[PDB]
From a paper:
PX domains have specialized protein structures involved in binding of phosphoinositides (PIs). Through binding to the various PIs PX domains provide site-specific membrane signals to modulate the intracellular localisation and biological activity of effector proteins. While all PI3Ks must interact with phosphoinositides as phosphorylation substrates within the catalytic domain active site, membrane-associated class II PI3Ks are unique in that they additionally contain PX and C2 domains appended to the C-terminus of the kinase domain. The PI3K-C2α PX domain folds into the canonical PX polypeptide chain topology comprising a three-stranded β-sheet meander that packs against a subdomain of 3 α-helices.
The model obtained based on the 2.5 Å data contains coordinates for residues 1421–1532 of the domain and an additional GSHH tag-derived sequence at the C-terminus. Residues 1490, 1491 and 1493–1496 were modelled as alanines since their side-chains were not clearly visible in the electron-density maps. This model, which we refer to here as 'structure B', was refined to an Rfactor/Rfree of 0.231/0.311. Our two new structures, A and B, are however not identical: they have two significantly different conformations of the putative PI binding region. Our two new structures of PI3K-C2α PX domain show significantly different conformations of the PI binding region. These differences are attributed to the presence of a putative ligand in the PtdIns(4,5)P2 binding cavity in one of the crystal structures. The ligand-bound structure exhibits an 'open' conformation of the PI binding region. Structure B has a more open PI binding site with the PPII/α2 loop and β1-β2 turn presenting conformations similar to that previously seen in the yeast PX domain protein Grd19p. The closed conformation of structure A is more similar to the PtdIns3P-bound Grd19p structure, while the PI3K-C2α PX structure B is closer to the un-liganded Grd19p structure. In structure B, the putative ligand appears to form hydrogen bonds with Arg1503, a highly conserved residue in PX domains. Modelling of an inositol ring in this site shows that, with minor adjustments of torsion angles Arg1503 would be optimally posed to interact with a phosphoryl group at inositol position 4 and that another residue from PPII/α2 loop would likely be involved in interaction with the 5-phosphate.
Numbering used by the authors: 1421 to 1536
Write the structure that this text describes.
């Protein structure tokens, strides 16, 4: 797009600063820079990002977002490991979205500020 040239979920980990949950480490590569940046975002921030996109855009403009209640009974680390994938495909979908999605303020905010 503008600056952002590629994004990906690079890896994640199991934090305890309140109690849980996981953090997803997101690698971003901008046009104006040679080195990636990395930001850290939980499942619920990506959710909160989608929810705010829906306020201002029609859903058919946006990727679908990955949430299953519990598949059936599963499973701490296991869900983290399926989110690495699902969040990453969300991200690829969201940034090859129209320009007004890819480059809109709500999606640049999401991606500024390592922990914020």
């Amino acid at each position: 797009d503008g600056r952002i040239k590629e994004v990906s979920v690079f890896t994640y980990h199991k934090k305890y600063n309140p109690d849980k949950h996981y953090i997803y480490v997101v690698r971003i590569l901008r046009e104006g820079q040679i080195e990636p940046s990395f930001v850290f975002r939980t499942f619920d921030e990506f959710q909160e990002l989608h929810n705010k996109l829906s306020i201002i855009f029609p859903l058919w403009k946006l990727p679908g977002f990955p949430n299953r209640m519990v598949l059936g009974r599963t499973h701490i680390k296991d869900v983290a490991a399926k989110r690495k994938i699902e969040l990453n495909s969300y991200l690829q979908s969201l940034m090859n979205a129209s320009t007004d999605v890819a480059e809109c303020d709500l999606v640049c905010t999401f991606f500024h500020g390592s922990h914020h």
